[PDB]
Design a binder for this molecule. Structure first.
Ligand SMILES: *[C@@H]1O[C@H](CO)[C@@H](O[C@@H]2O[C@H](CO)[C@@H](O[C@@H]3O[C@H](CO[C@H]4O[C@H](CO)[C@@H](O)[C@H](O[C@H]5O[C@H](CO)[C@@H](O)[C@H](O)[C@@H]5O)[C@@H]4O)[C@@H](O)[C@H](O[C@H]4O[C@H](CO)[C@@H](O)[C@H](O)[C@@H]4O[C@H]4O[C@H](CO)[C@@H](O)[C@H](O)[C@@H]4O[C@H]4O[C@H](CO)[C@@H](O)[C@H](O)[C@@H]4O)[C@@H]3O)[C@H](O)[C@H]2NC(C)=O)[C@H](O)[C@H]1NC(C)=O
Ligand SMILES: CCCCC/C=C\C/C=C\CCCCCCCC(=O)O[C@H](COC(=O)CCCCCCCCCCCCCCC)COP(=O)([O-])OCC[N+](C)(C)C
Ligand SMILES: CCCCC/C=C\C/C=C\CCCCCCCC(=O)O[C@H](COC(=O)CCCCCCCCCCCCCCC)COP(=O)([O-])OCC[N+](C)(C)C
Lengths: 112, 167, 41, 34, 110
């Protein structure tokens, strides 16, 4: 009946441990050494280098092509940090509408 | 569009005229019925239409927009599982009959890639397509399509008498 | 908790490997498309 | 507003016009295609 | 029946096939280092005992498996082209597929 009652404190659940941090640093620069190994394999050592560069008047569609390919990764990279799905979606709309025309005149200009 | 991919378009208009007024679909599609199979079949048929249109011509784009409507079919209805046991059942029957090609690889393997990284984003369906017994047909056919691809590379390069002792 | 109100992937010490590998695949992909277009076959 | 018998006549006449012009399309297609 | 003719003969066909076409060199060495990133992440999951986010692991893993998949699906269209699909339409579809995979894998890393 009435009187004092024993307390209750709600012993919480345990969180699993994350990682030792310098192990994660070790694997981060291992992956960095692998990607740098990829680029150093590409650019000179395996001779799959830049054989032709379109220095004519179709260079501007090539720079537009790099603007689209780098542009969607800038949009996705902004979407990774904050930047709600609607502003990303209108961003890739406002890039995708002029960008698809200058990334198709370029591929019309190169028949390979 | 689906029956137009199976036969000529004159059978597509018969199929559209059938399913517009059929009593089997108007039962779950009555005027006041917001009961989650109103949006399901109109994504089952767009999913299957881009799948057949992706498996005929072997296009990467039609098998990615087959996977976008597969994802948008997963967002809607809980009987998406049917699709992830039917498109792998189709491809596997394409393997047993000896009708493998590069179109069948180049359609199925990007359907599974985009459609299984994408259907995992719905919070009702978490890592279930990694560890459920009904999504294992798709990962199994995605498994052996690599073996049929590489084996299909070595069959067309070494002679027939050494090729018959391989399969 | 909301989907936003979680410990972030750069905040956690375990997910630095996968952010570094996704960033590696993306940058290697950009040099793959520029290197693929600018080579001559 | 439209009644229910008049909606029945509307639904049936959309069905009959639908199947009729489907059959006309299939006849014109099947006769005049290589 | 030691299969010594298989690895040497396919070594001559494939290893001759690499440097005759300069773009297949890009495709198969980029596939190979994608396999190295899959092995590095898999031995990170083996070297420690937990997979604590488990959406980060399938993010960084399915981007490598999916990108390898799309690269093979372009190499098969450059080696012997599909009938209705040009070699330039073989590549823009790879670009669109790769950007969709990069978005979903940057959404799934959180
Ligand atoms: C679906 O719906 C369902 C129904 O709506 C729902 O089911 C209900 O779920 C809740 C949540 O779990 C259940 O409540 C728990 O029930 C436990 C059952 O214990 C039984 O056996 C005990 C003896 O072994 C009995 O003591 C107990 O109660 C009896 O006595 C009562 C008083 O005399 C009386 O009122 C009862 O009717 C009954 O006669 C029952 O028979 C029960 O053990 C548990 O109590 C703990 O948790 C409460 C808070 O959640 C505290 O108020 C309570 O004091 C106990 O606290 C302990 O645990 C806390 C952490 O959990 C600690 O912080 C406390 O300090 C304390 O810890 C001590 O004990 C620990 C061991 O337990 C020890 O580790 C500590 O060190 C410390 O010593 C709670 O009441 C409810 O019974 C379910 N009902 C039904 C019908 O199933 C279900 O959850 C829904 N589904 C979903 C997914 O949500
Ligand atoms: C070459 C061009 C490439 C363009 C790529 C564009 C799209 C790729 C295709 C598919 C991607 C699938 C992944 C879904 C991502 C959106 C989820 C989201 O938006 O919800 C997220 C939260 O997730 C969720 O809870 C899951 C929600 C699932 C969505 C269900 C709706 C699907 C049906 C929509 C169709 C509606 C009708 C349209 C008809 C056509 C909100 O994010 P946020 O606002 O907090 O942003 C901040 C970003 N932080 C947090 C990372 C910082
Ligand atoms: C994709 C194609 C779509 C095909 C058809 C789709 C759906 C049809 C299915 C059901 C319809 C049944 C209607 C139920 C409601 C009853 C109301 C009713 O019956 O109105 C009737 C009369 O109507 C009519 O004379 C119909 C007039 C002509 C119709 C024209 C068609 C419209 C399209 C024009 C668009 C043009 C733009 C071109 C864009 C490119 C009266 O009713 P009332 O007494 O209540 O008016 C209130 C009382 N006053 C009269 C005082 C106000």
């Amino acid at each position: 009946k009435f009187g004092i009652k024993p307390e209750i404190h709600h012993i919480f659940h345990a969180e699993p441990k994350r990682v030792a941090k310098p192990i994660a640093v070790i694997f981060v620069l291992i992956i960095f050494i692998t990607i740098l190994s990829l680029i150093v394999t590409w650019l000179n050592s395996c001779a799959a280098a830049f054989n032709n560069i379109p220095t004519g008047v179709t260079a501007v569609y090539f720079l537009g092509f790099i603007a689209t390919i780098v542009g969607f990764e800038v949009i996705f990279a902004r979407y990774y940090l904050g930047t709600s799905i609607f502003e990303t979606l209108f961003s890739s709309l406002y890039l995708g509408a002029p960008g698809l025309l200058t990334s198709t005149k370029f591929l019309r200009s190169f028949g390979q | 569009e689906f029956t137009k991919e199976i036969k000529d378009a004159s059978a597509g208009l018969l199929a559209a005229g059938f399913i517009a007024i059929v009593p089997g679909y108007i039962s779950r599609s009555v005027a006041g019925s917001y009961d989650n199979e109103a949006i399901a079949i109109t994504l089952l048929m767009v999913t299957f239409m881009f799948w057949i249109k992706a498996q005929k011509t072997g296009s990467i784009m039609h098998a990615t927009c087959a996977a976008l409507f597969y994802f948008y079919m997963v967002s809607a209805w809980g009987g998406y599982v049917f699709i992830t046991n039917l498109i792998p059942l189709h491809v596997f029957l394409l393997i047993l009959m000896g009708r493998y090609s590069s179109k069948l690889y180049s359609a199925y393997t990007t359907w599974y890639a985009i459609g299984t990284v994408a259907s995992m984003q719905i919070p009702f369906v978490g890592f279930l397509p990694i560890r459920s017994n009904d999504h294992m047909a798709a990962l199994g056919v995605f498994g052996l399509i690599q073996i049929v691809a590489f084996g299909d590379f070595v069959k067309g390069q070494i002679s027939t008498a050494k090729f018959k002792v391989i399969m | 908790l909301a989907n936003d109100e979680y410990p972030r992937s750069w905040e956690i010490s375990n997910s630095w490997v996968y952010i570094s590998a996704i960033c590696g695949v993306i940058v290697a992909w950009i040099f793959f498309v520029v290197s693929f277009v600018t080579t001559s076959s | 507003m439209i009644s229910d018998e008049q909606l029945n006549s509307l639904a049936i006449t959309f069905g009959i016009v639908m199947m009729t012009l489907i059959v006309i399309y299939h006849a014109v297609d099947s006769t005049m295609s290589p | 029946t030691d299969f010594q003719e298989t690895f040497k003969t396919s070594k001559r066909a494939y290893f001759a096939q690499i440097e005759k076409y300069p773009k297949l060199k890009l495709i198969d060495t980029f596939c190979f280092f994608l396999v190295l990133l899959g092995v590095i992440q898999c031995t990170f999951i083996i070297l420690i005992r937990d997979n604590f986010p488990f959406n980060a692991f399938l993010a960084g893993f399915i981007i490598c498996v999916g990108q390898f998949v799309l690269l093979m699906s372009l190499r098969l269209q450059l080696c012997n082209s599909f009938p209705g699909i040009s070699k330039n339409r073989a590549f823009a579809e790879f670009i669109v597929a790769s950007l969709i995979l990069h978005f979903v894998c940057l959404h799934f890393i959180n």
